[PDB]
Amino acid sequence: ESADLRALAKHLYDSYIKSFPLTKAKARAILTGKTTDKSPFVIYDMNSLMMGEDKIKFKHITPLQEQSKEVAIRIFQGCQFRSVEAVQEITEYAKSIPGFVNLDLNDQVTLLKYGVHEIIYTMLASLMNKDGVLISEGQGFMTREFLKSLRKPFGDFMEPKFEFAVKFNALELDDSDLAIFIAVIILSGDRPGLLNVKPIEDIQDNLLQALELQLKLNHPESSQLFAKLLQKMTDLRQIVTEHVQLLQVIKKTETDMSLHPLLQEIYKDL
Amino acid sequence: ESADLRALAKHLYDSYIKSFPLTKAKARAILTGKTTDKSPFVIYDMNSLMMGEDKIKFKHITPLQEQSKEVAIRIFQGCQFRSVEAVQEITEYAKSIPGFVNLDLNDQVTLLKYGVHEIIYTMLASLMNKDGVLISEGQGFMTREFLKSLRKPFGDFMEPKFEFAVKFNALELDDSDLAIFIAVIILSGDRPGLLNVKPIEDIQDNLLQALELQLKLNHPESSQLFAKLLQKMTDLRQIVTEHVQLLQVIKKTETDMSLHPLLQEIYKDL
Numbered sequence: 001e002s003a004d005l006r007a008l009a010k011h012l013y014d015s016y017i018k019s020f021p022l023t024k025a026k027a028r029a030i031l032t033g034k035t036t037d038k039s040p041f042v043i044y045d046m047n048s049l050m051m052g053e054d055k056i057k058f059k060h061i062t063p064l065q066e067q068s069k070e071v072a073i074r075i076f077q078g079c080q081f082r083s084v085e086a087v088q089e090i091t092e093y094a095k096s097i098p099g100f101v102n103l104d105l106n107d108q109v110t111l112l113k114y115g116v117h118e119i120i121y122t123m124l125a126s127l128m129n130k131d132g133v134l135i136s137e138g139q140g141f142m143t144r145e146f147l148k149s150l151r152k153p154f155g156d157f158m159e160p161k162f163e164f165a166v167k168f169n170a171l172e173l174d175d176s177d178l179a180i181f182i183a184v185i186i187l188s189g190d191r192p193g194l195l196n197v198k199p200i201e202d203i204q205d206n207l208l209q210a211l212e213l214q215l216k217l218n219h220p221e222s223s224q225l226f227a228k229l230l231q232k233m234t235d236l237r238q239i240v241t242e243h244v245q246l247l248q249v250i251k252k253t254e255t256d257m258s259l260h261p262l263l264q265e266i267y268k269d270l
Numbered sequence: 271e272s273a274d275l276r277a278l279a280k281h282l283y284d285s286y287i288k289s290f291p292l293t294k295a296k297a298r299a300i301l302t303g304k305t306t307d308k309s310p311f312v313i314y315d316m317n318s319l320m321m322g323e324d325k326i327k328f329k330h331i332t333p334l335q336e337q338s339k340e341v342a343i344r345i346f347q348g349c350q351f352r353s354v355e356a357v358q359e360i361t362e363y364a365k366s367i368p369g370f371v372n373l374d375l376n377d378q379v380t381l382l383k384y385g386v387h388e389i390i391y392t393m394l395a396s397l398m399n400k401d402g403v404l405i406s407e408g409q410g411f412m413t414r415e416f417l418k419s420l421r422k423p424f425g426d427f428m429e430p431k432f433e434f435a436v437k438f439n440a441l442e443l444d445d446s447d448l449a450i451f452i453a454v455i456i457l458s459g460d461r462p463g464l465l466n467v468k469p470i471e472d473i474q475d476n477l478l479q480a481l482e483l484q485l486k487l488n489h490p491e492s493s494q495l496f497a498k499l500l501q502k503m504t505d506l507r508q509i510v511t512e513h514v515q516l517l518q519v520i521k522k523t524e525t526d527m528s529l530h531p532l533l534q535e536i537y538k539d540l
């Protein structure tokens with residue numbers, strides 16, 4: 001029944017909104033869009049950041065650059081904090097996906113453990129454009145150029161996410177679309193360690209049919225878009241893998257410090 | 271028009287028959303040990319490998335190989351030959367894809383360059399089953415176990431293909447299906463370097479439409495096969511990567527091993 005898919009599409013969309021503060025419709029308005037009623041603090045240099053941390057509303061540390069930790073490190077770590085927030089938002093979202101909670105708890109955890117990273121770069125693209133990503137709930141805008149001027153290890157961290165985003169945003173998907181796409185990602189039946197795949201693929205099968213209709217009705221002139229969106233998952237996977245690869249390198253930089261025990265603890269690997 | 275799409279399916283399936291001597295249909299006919307019109311000799315150990323040169327067309331060594339390229343070298347030097355064989359074949363199938371020959375020559379080359387191996391492993395699955403894979407146009411069958419027991423490095427070149435094949439063959443796809451899917455793989459667009467992506471995406475778009483209808487008509491009861499298949503493209507990707515790494519590793523461990531030209535040109539780094 002197309003009444004079930006259309007229903008599901010709306011459902012997920014409703015939960016996506018109630019779960020994700022910064023939506024693409026929003027982030028778009030702030031970005032390249034106009035909407036001149038409140039402009040984001042731009043960060044394009046070692047000064048913008050400095051003269052922007054004490055001013056903006058960030059959670060980690062105050063702006064101080066004088067032989068006290070490196071700017072890059074404080075930035076990278078900022079991503080962690082925010083992603084950890086994201087993981088929480090996503091975890092609540094999956095909970096609204098029909099059948100998700102009725103699954104083995106060990107599977108839910110597994111489905112989340114591996115889907116969180118892919119869902120994160122998918123949405124980050126909602127906040128990105130060719131020249132930078134919105135920052136701090138959208139209060140800021142760290143340029144893409146400043147990110148590349150970062151330290152040797154941290155300067156090639158967001159580029160692959162920028163290139164992904166640039167091609168991804170070309171599909172011109174709106175939140176109602178990403179809502180179901182994000183659902184398809186969580187209900188991935190190929191995650192290592194699952195104990196009962198049948199129910200996981202049944203849900204995804206259902207989500208896939210839902211995405212297909214949503215896209216056809218939402219983009220009648222966009223040909224075989226369903227196909228293309230499912231193809232960007234290969235990029236997501238490479239974006240995710242490549243990320244753990246640049247993570248180990250970072251792990252081969254900062255380590256032993258008897259002050260991190262509790263902070264390093266809050267940050268596992270997702 | 272469905273007629274136009276069905277026409278293109280027939281066309282591609284037709285060239286598929288014309289460019290690949292060993293179709294999945296023949297392979298399964300051989301693998302399902304019933305049609306004894308011609309059964310395969312099985313390789314599951316050295317002794318069998320020896321008797322391999324016997325009733326199978328081989329221009330390699332028959333007796334001992336310790337003092338003349340061990341078993342692993344014999345198996346993979348042969349595996350290179352088939353790969354080149356496979357590329358050439360796909361290069362032929364490719365020219366038959368409506369439009370491919372009309373694209374910028376450079377793109378043609380780039381499409382084959384990244385498309386070649388994804389297709390090889392796709393079709394390679396047609397010759398596989400949980401316990402092994404067919405060799406020498408079907409005349410032989412080398413055990414997955416013999417393969418996994420090869421010398422430290424070589425020992426793990428095939429296992430990941432087998433893992434892919436078991437999942438992929440699960441879709442129970444047939445030749446006419448792989449035909450449109452093999453075309454969809456070549457006509458990508460995200461291949462690194464392509465000059466004109468639009469003409470390429472316009473074709474793949476058509477191929478995708480052609481693959482969708484086919485799957486519906488051919489597998490009515492198989493829900494979401496189109497998408498499940500399209501997601502297998504991610505699986506293929508990673509495999510190519512695992513392959514390149516191992517390859518890069520052999521180049522060092524075996525200074526005497528010589529990758530084939532048509533294969534070195536295809537392969538690069540990063």
Ligand SMILES: CCc1ccc(O[C@@H](Cc2ccccc2)C(=O)O)cc1
Binds near residue numbers: 347353513529533
């Ligand atoms: C002799 C080293 C080697 C070369 C190629 C190779 O894989 C083939 C492809 C292949 C792999 C396994 C069965 C058939 C073809 C390629 O990289 O073109 C594996 C090992």
